[PDB]
Design an enzyme around this catalytic site. Structure first.
Site, PDB file in Angstrom:
ATOM      1  N   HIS A 162       0.851  -1.210   0.000  1.00 30.10           N
ATOM      2  CA  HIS A 162       0.000   0.000   0.000  1.00 30.10           C
ATOM      3  C   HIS A 162       0.883   1.255   0.000  1.00 30.10           C
ATOM      4  CE1 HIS A 162      -3.959  -2.174   0.893  1.00 30.10           C
ATOM      5  NE2 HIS A 162      -3.114  -3.106   1.346  1.00 30.10           N
ATOM      6  N   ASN A 216      -9.920  -3.059   2.912  1.00 31.97           N
ATOM      7  CA  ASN A 216      -9.661  -3.056   1.447  1.00 31.97           C
ATOM      8  C   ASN A 216     -10.977  -2.779   0.730  1.00 31.97           C
ATOM      9  OD1 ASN A 216      -6.903  -3.458   1.458  1.00 31.97           O
ATOM     10  ND2 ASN A 216      -7.038  -5.683   1.251  1.00 31.97           N
ATOM     11  N   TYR A 272       2.003  -4.990  11.927  1.00 31.91           N
ATOM     12  CA  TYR A 272       1.815  -3.524  11.847  1.00 31.91           C
ATOM     13  C   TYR A 272       2.521  -2.842  13.020  1.00 31.91           C
ATOM     14  CZ  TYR A 272      -1.855  -4.431   8.353  1.00 31.91           C
ATOM     15  OH  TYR A 272      -2.577  -4.871   7.291  1.00 31.91           O
TER      16      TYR A 272
HETATM   17  C1  HEM Z   1      -7.469  -8.823   5.264  1.00 34.56           C
HETATM   18  C2  HEM Z   1      -6.208  -8.710   4.912  1.00 34.56           C
HETATM   19  C3  HEM Z   1      -5.556  -7.384   4.828  1.00 34.56           C
HETATM   20  C4  HEM Z   1      -6.023  -6.121   4.602  1.00 34.56           C
HETATM   21  C5  HEM Z   1      -7.450  -5.689   4.325  1.00 34.56           C
HETATM   22  C6  HEM Z   1      -4.904  -5.256   4.690  1.00 34.56           C
HETATM   23  C7  HEM Z   1      -4.998  -3.880   4.530  1.00 34.56           C
HETATM   24  C8  HEM Z   1      -3.903  -3.029   4.568  1.00 34.56           C
HETATM   25  C9  HEM Z   1      -3.983  -1.619   4.341  1.00 34.56           C
HETATM   26  C10 HEM Z   1      -5.183  -0.816   3.954  1.00 34.56           C
HETATM   27  C11 HEM Z   1      -2.750  -1.110   4.456  1.00 34.56           C
HETATM   28  C12 HEM Z   1      -2.391   0.350   4.272  1.00 34.56           C
HETATM   29  C13 HEM Z   1      -2.710   1.263   5.451  1.00 34.56           C
HETATM   30  C14 HEM Z   1      -2.232   2.681   5.093  1.00 34.56           C
HETATM   31  O1  HEM Z   1      -2.897   3.370   4.264  1.00 34.56           O
HETATM   32  O2  HEM Z   1      -1.175   3.183   5.605  1.00 34.56           O
HETATM   33  C15 HEM Z   1      -1.880  -2.199   4.777  1.00 34.56           C
HETATM   34  C16 HEM Z   1      -0.524  -2.015   5.076  1.00 34.56           C
HETATM   35  C17 HEM Z   1       0.222  -3.105   5.542  1.00 34.56           C
HETATM   36  N1  HEM Z   1      -0.176  -4.415   5.724  1.00 34.56           N
HETATM   37 FE1  HEM Z   1      -1.936  -5.127   5.501  1.00 34.56          FE
HETATM   38  N2  HEM Z   1      -3.812  -5.940   4.988  1.00 34.56           N
HETATM   39  C18 HEM Z   1      -4.112  -7.248   5.069  1.00 34.56           C
HETATM   40  C19 HEM Z   1      -3.288  -8.338   5.358  1.00 34.56           C
HETATM   41  C20 HEM Z   1      -1.964  -8.213   5.719  1.00 34.56           C
HETATM   42  C21 HEM Z   1      -1.125  -9.268   6.190  1.00 34.56           C
HETATM   43  C22 HEM Z   1      -1.522 -10.733   6.339  1.00 34.56           C
HETATM   44  C23 HEM Z   1       0.053  -8.686   6.555  1.00 34.56           C
HETATM   45  C24 HEM Z   1       1.291  -9.266   7.146  1.00 34.56           C
HETATM   46  C25 HEM Z   1       1.338 -10.444   7.698  1.00 34.56           C
HETATM   47  C26 HEM Z   1      -0.043  -7.298   6.294  1.00 34.56           C
HETATM   48  C27 HEM Z   1       1.013  -6.430   6.496  1.00 34.56           C
HETATM   49  C28 HEM Z   1       0.926  -5.085   6.160  1.00 34.56           C
HETATM   50  C29 HEM Z   1       2.071  -4.177   6.286  1.00 34.56           C
HETATM   51  C30 HEM Z   1       3.487  -4.461   6.668  1.00 34.56           C
HETATM   52  C31 HEM Z   1       1.654  -2.973   5.876  1.00 34.56           C
HETATM   53  C32 HEM Z   1       2.461  -1.711   5.864  1.00 34.56           C
HETATM   54  C33 HEM Z   1       1.892  -1.122   7.171  1.00 34.56           C
HETATM   55  C34 HEM Z   1       2.501   0.190   7.392  1.00 34.56           C
HETATM   56  O3  HEM Z   1       3.640   0.476   6.829  1.00 34.56           O
HETATM   57  O4  HEM Z   1       1.890   0.985   8.153  1.00 34.56           O
HETATM   58  N3  HEM Z   1      -1.267  -7.048   5.788  1.00 34.56           N
HETATM   59  N4  HEM Z   1      -2.609  -3.383   4.862  1.00 34.56           N
END
Ligand code: HEM
Ligand code: HEM
Ligand SMILES: [Ca+2]
Ligand SMILES: [Ca+2]
Ligand SMILES: [Ca+2]
Ligand SMILES: [Ca+2]
Ligand SMILES: [Ca+2]
Ligand SMILES: [Ca+2]
Lengths: 679, 677, 359
Positions: free
Chosen positions: A63, A136, A350
């Protein structure tokens, strides 16, 4: 008194200073003579260039491409009967919010209009702490266990020898993972639908994806799904439009959102839940712990909790949008997790990844991350510590600070508490629940629920993407998995890539459908405010500019964003043909006074050959309302080869009749009869 | 293979942790089969922590780029002009790594933005790493490094909303350009075809600054670096570049990667202008001023050697993303000048690697390591890889017998400052009045382009300035353009509904210089790697036969052939659905496919009109186009292309078609298809 | 506050400038750079302890841990879109810092040392000449201690070569401790010149004895020892001295046990004569190490501190348990008032240097 107000810096007046308030200059280096070498003792130079040298921080691991806005959430009622959550505890109760929208795969700078899943992350700055819903635009996810997230993301991100390509869904590794990991089918079908290429952040929904819990003060719990339902209605680009728009305006979605807020058209969502009983976890024909499944709205209707409205743009994009650090761990009393193995692992990720971005542990101190209530805890020190803690006994239990801070729990200080009904039983296992094993029924449910032309678009998106897969083995494996969802889809996709589809395997085939997932089928838009009208005029005929000025008045009345296009700028003209493209408009109007610009032999050193006609033809081929206003309207539609009796084609002498017809076309938004279907 | 010692092979074996414990990584450890995940799952946390921490800060500028390994070969013993060891013998070979880039865009932004481009070369010399951190434009926007953040803030997206990523197309950029007239020369280059090069292979590299060559006897000469492309100079047209930025954001990195894999590794003659110290102020400008070129007529290029890129990276992150160039990476035989832009850069590149690497041992990264021994008393720091044996890392010492020894002009082949260099005067934050002519050289450059080239530059300015909202900025822009050329100011002004100010002839002149025109640099010296799209159909066996025949004769001459049809099969590379004119340097239609070009043609397999759009776009963007087989007029009439047009081919014979068409690919663009004011 | 404070010589204000001192010149680089290491990011000036108390107007932006929300969306100079703000500050406008205008540079760009820096020995000898005889002995003794722990015979010889260039007498006296011959005298840099204000021993009595630390060694044995300690405390605390009453065990009016007490804890040590019994061979107890009470007294005397016995009975293998009653900075009075008036003079003298042997 909001942490953002206190940290605002005004530079509208004053003399330049260092970061420690010493007045300085910053335009010429200190040198040993007028043609001499720069001195090490030039602190003005080094402080400025050091700051510049260190401006960048790591982009988000996923993202990375996105844009944010401020706003308000307002509760519709006292929801005490289903949750303890304080932000939901009274009619009319308002909580400030920040939202960031995003793609998933692309780096910073990648186009908004890539085919991708999209992020919809909402922070509620509640009076009992920050609550994030990190969602999402698609209600289901590719994978069933968080431990697989690096495999998914490595597979869709560019191949790591050459960092090619920036097309998440259009290379070998992505289709290799999809074909080897069949859990991916439901989200893959959503991403290959128009949900992969939404018209704007405002014209898509938000989903929490996971089943969560609503927890009452009495300790009882219900299972919930979050749905943020757009008040702007649902809309997509067509792919051939999305590809051009990625080049012509890489910032299209961030600009769409920014402009809508500036014009007083801040976007709105009904924040909704499906609520079902704990006893229904396995009642709907799948497991509510499985994030590849939706609860069909026919089994569990949406309850409207409140209104989300975004109505203020950031002051500094970097300080607010880039630095906002979301966490599903940002939870408040009255909400609890589920044993969804995807959600479970997210909680770890996160908190950890903010150490990478911020470079230190005090990221919750950045104004955008701060809460709007007191912080009382024994967290200390760390790089970038911005607090001066008065309590010199930061341990529990203590007498030397009279036992403060006091523990909070179900019975003290409105503490968070784990839903007390929750249990665990069995072996400590690294094994998948057999309840998770149906990877193909819901993709089929989703496909069945789209209209025929919508099914064509999805098939065409798969034909496009899979045709770019070099491995014949990967392509074969893909058709095997697609065939489990739909023989018809596997046949039509196999046709574009010159392979035979596998024989029908009806194990997971069915005819069931569900409301609410079709874009094409979701009816006219409920509002046309903000929609973009290109008026193609000319400076050569003063009649053409009068026609344009009269259309402008009549269209601007209804909140449409009107661009008058001509060869050159002058009063009443917004843009030159040179900078104009059909990707910039939701509808295109030629004033008949400009008919000569559409001639096959039309040439000008002021814009590329054929530009005026190309805009009109592109707009028509991409399904948009197009028309000629003036009287020789029939005349000009021949040059375009645009049939005047066409659905979504307008031909009127009267301005008032033209607009009244044309505005209905904008609400229809897309004329799908202009797209060929497979036999 | 030059970094083979660091390579990790995962073609065999069981999954391990980073400490070699065999593990799994596909299912979390849970308290029961529908249970919560356990904190004791180290397999989960070690994998997700690594993923969580993959990203490093992008480069503050030049974030978007691509790199390749190669070899530098000296043509001569250059002892007579420089002590530089990598130049000291005929045929002496030195490994290189090069990174090409844009300037303004973030690391995911399209390659084919209008922008300045980087061309950074590391020579892994037997006397240390030497870096030439150059651009594809020989002059810089600003005269003093202290101004770099002002330039880069003004061109980068507006900081309230981070819009737009069009470096040269928003108010703040034109505000800076118009208030800082030093910008005019680089601006005119960026508004020319040099702002949208056809590839990295089809642009030059420039050191921009005057440097010194220093002999072992201590005498010095002033030099400019010029890396002269052996592929020839070529541009996109803007209308093409915008579409290509959407259809293929990776176009330049893919072109380079493909050229190396196909054995067409790009080549540059590494050249210098050499002039005397006494000529610093002799050419009508100051050689310390980085906004000025030495016209080739005043000082000819000396070819020093060959730069060939012929090996792609193994891991892009580890090699391309992590390469950390520095102008401070200097060797004996080279020295700096008092160019106030160069002077400040020396600080910036050592400092900024702390940001990117997160610690001080960034020179220990495989891509940054030298190929000769390191002997120094640098110690510790985050990520220290070395285990130093010397327990007395101080000078002067007796407990390590006075090692390492001090290297200087007279001992150990030390670097040394050119000993003729002096300073004299007040300690001043003042600009040399010798820097004050901001407009003559912009006019020199404009004067040195062909009429169609001049039109393209005016059109780029009309495009960009028409997007500026501020009427006061647009007026200030016309005031600066007018000091370079009244004609440019009048032609730009016409597009934006303003009057140009009255002619101000202070800096006007009719001088011209060789070697800056793209259109004027004549046909390309090779067409190998150029892209031919053949539009065919599956509906006619004879269309596929024509395409196979054309493929065989085009591939013989090293052209990259794409056969397009409705669907894939043996001999068809791409579908109409994925094909675009930005994908090709020339387009051929086989006359067996003529039915696809009718206004009536429709298919669920591709967008309405796609076959004819590829042909019309290619024609309109100036590319060689044609119909092979003899029946040409149905296709050409549908396209509104005249059969007698320059770079329009219609032959029955495959052999005669290809001989004509290959001449067209060499010409590369047919400029008679663009209107003039 | 303390750990995060990030000092820089580059934190300079209008009215101050640098000199071409090559040590100072390079410091200017080091302290801006090293804060990136400590803070882990470029916004270290935003830490409360580092913030200025006047407005900041500049175009610095972004970076890890950016706390500010900048309103100015045109952070470049020159600009019209923010009306040319912030404005340039210099000698003639906005109270800008400015380099001293008289400053010039002339000559080759050189990595050479000025020959005007080459006398390394005259000023060491000036400093050594300006110390009192006992102070010179302390310095000789510090060098004998340190150089005696050097294992390399070659390094020890090189050290006597350099010390010899400052003072042959220093080289001889240090040589004696480490079993080496001093090299023959070399008088190039020898002189008899002296300067005021560098001697500690010669700087005379302290201008105030407030905060100086008086340890009173008493006993819980004798309610009269605790009464002596209480009257001494009242009279010492009146003049702003920090009093510690020491005894075997804590109670009302006792601050510290003999177990935790040490002569390093005091600027002066008083025994109340009611506690005389603790100062004898006898002095064993499970409440403190053998000999501890007398060791505090003997340590304080050996380290030059004012010491005494208050109450009138001082000999009683008390002083005799070690030290002479006629000694400078040794006090014996029955009267608490007379005792304190004498003792306070001793605290102002601070050190009795007649107790250290000379070469
Ligand atoms: C239902 C599943 C998921 C959804 C809906 C989702 C949604 C998101 C969203 C919207 C962001 C961006 C937030 C922003 O605008 O700053 C994001 C960032 C991120 N997500 Fe997820 N995610 C999902 C699953 C996962 C999984 C399984 C992992 C790791 C095991 C993950 C790791 C991350 C990481 C590392 C970031 C960067 C966060 C940051 O730098 O603040 N996500 N995700
Ligand atoms: C003649 C003028 C200049 C040229 C030709 C030039 C060239 C380049 C190039 C080619 C890169 C990318 C290197 C790579 O591919 O990794 C780069 C990066 C950079 N440049 Fe420059 N530059 C110029 C002026 C400046 C100035 C005046 C400054 C600062 C005062 C500066 C600061 C930087 C920084 C901070 C980076 C990122 C370096 C890194 O992350 O390794 N540049 N420059
Ligand atoms: Ca791949
Ligand atoms: Ca759609
Ligand atoms: Ca609990
Ligand atoms: Ca701007
Ligand atoms: Ca050109
Ligand atoms: Ca760090």
């Amino acid at each position: 008194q909001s942490p953002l107000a206190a940290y605002e810096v005004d530079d509208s007046t004053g003399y330049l200073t260092s970061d420690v308030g010493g007045p300085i200059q910053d335009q010429t280096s200190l040198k040993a003579g007028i043609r001499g070498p720069t001195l090490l003792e030039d602190f003005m130079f080094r402080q400025k260039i050091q700051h510049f040298d260190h401006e960048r921080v790591p982009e988000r691991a996923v993202h990375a491409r996105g844009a944010g806005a401020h706003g308000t959430f307002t509760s519709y009622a006292d929801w005490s009967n289903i949750t303890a959550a304080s932000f939901l505890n009274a009619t009319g109760k308002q909580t400030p919010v920040f939202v960031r929208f995003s793609t998933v795969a692309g780096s910073r700078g990648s186009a908004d209009t890539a085919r991708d899943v999209h992020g919809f992350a909402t922070r509620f700055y509640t009076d009992e702490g920050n609550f994030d819903i990190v969602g999402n635009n698609i209600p289901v996810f590719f994978i069933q266990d968080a431990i697989q997230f690096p495999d998914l993301i490595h597979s869709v991100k560019p191949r790591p020898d050459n960092e090619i390509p920036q097309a998440a869904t259009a290379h070998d590794s992505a289709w290799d993972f999809f074909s080897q990991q069949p859990s991916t089918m439901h989200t893959l079908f959503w991403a290959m639908s128009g949900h992969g290429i939404p018209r704007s952040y405002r014209h898509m929904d938000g989903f929490g994806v996971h089943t969560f819990r609503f927890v009452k003060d009495d300790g009882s719990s219900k299972l919930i799904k979050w749905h943020f339902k757009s008040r702007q209605g649902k809309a997509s680009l067509v792919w051939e439009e999305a590809q051009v728009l990625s080049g012509k305006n890489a910032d299209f979605h961030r600009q769409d959102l920014w402009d809508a807020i500036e014009s007083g058209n801040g976007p709105e969502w009904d924040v909704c839940v499906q609520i079902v009983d704990e006893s229904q976890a396995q009642a709907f024909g799948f497991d509510l712990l499985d994030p590849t499944k939706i609860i069909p709205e026919e089994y569990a209707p949406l309850t409207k909790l409140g209104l989300l409205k975004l109505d203020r743009n950031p002051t500094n994009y970097f300080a607010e949008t880039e630095q906002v650090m979301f966490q599903p761990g940002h939870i408040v009393r009255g909400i609890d997790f589920t044993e969804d193995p995807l959600l479970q692992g997210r909680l770890f990720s996160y908190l950890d990844t903010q150490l990478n971005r911020n470079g230190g542990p005090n990221f919750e101190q950045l104004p955008i991350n701060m809460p709007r209530v007191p912080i009382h805890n024994n967290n200390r020190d760390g790089a970038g510590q911005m607090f001066i803690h008065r309590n010199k006994y930061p341990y529990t239990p203590n007498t030397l600070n009279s036992g403060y801070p006091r523990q909070a729990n179900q019975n003290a200080g409105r503490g968070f508490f784990t839903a007390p009904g929750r249990t665990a039983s069995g072996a400590l296992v690294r094994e998948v629940s057999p309840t998770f094993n149906d990877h193909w029924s819901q993709p089929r449910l989703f496909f069945n629920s789209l209209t025929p032309v919508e099914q064509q678009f999805l098939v065409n998106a798969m034909r496009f993407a899979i045709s770019l897969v070099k491995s014949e083995e990967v392509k074969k494996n893909v058709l095997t998995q697609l065939n489990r969802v739909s023989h018809d889809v596997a046949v039509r996709v196999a046709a574009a890539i010159g392979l035979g589809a596998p024989d029908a395997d009806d194990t997971y085939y069915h005819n069931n459908k569900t409301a609410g997932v079709s874009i094409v089928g979701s009816g006219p838009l409920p509002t046309i405010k903000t929609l973009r009208v290109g008026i193609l005029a000319t400076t050569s005929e003063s009649s053409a500019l009068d026609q344009a000025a009269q259309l402008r008045t009549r269209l601007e009345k209804d909140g449409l964003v009107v661009t008058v296009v001509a060869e050159t700028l002058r009063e009443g003209v917004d843009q030159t043909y040179s900078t104009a493209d059909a990707t910039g408009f939701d509808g295109v109007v030629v004033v008949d006074g400009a008919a000569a610009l559409f001639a096959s032999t039309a040439s000008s050193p002021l814009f590329p050959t054929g530009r005026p006609l190309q805009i009109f033809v592109d707009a028509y081929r991409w399904g948009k309302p197009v028309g000629v206003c003036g009287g020789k309207s029939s005349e000009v539609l021949d040059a375009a080869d645009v049939p005047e009796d066409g659905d979504g084609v307008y031909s009127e002498e009267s301005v008032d009749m033209f607009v009244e017809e044309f505005e209905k076309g904008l609400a229809t938004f897309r004329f799908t009869d202009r797209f060929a279907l497979d036999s």
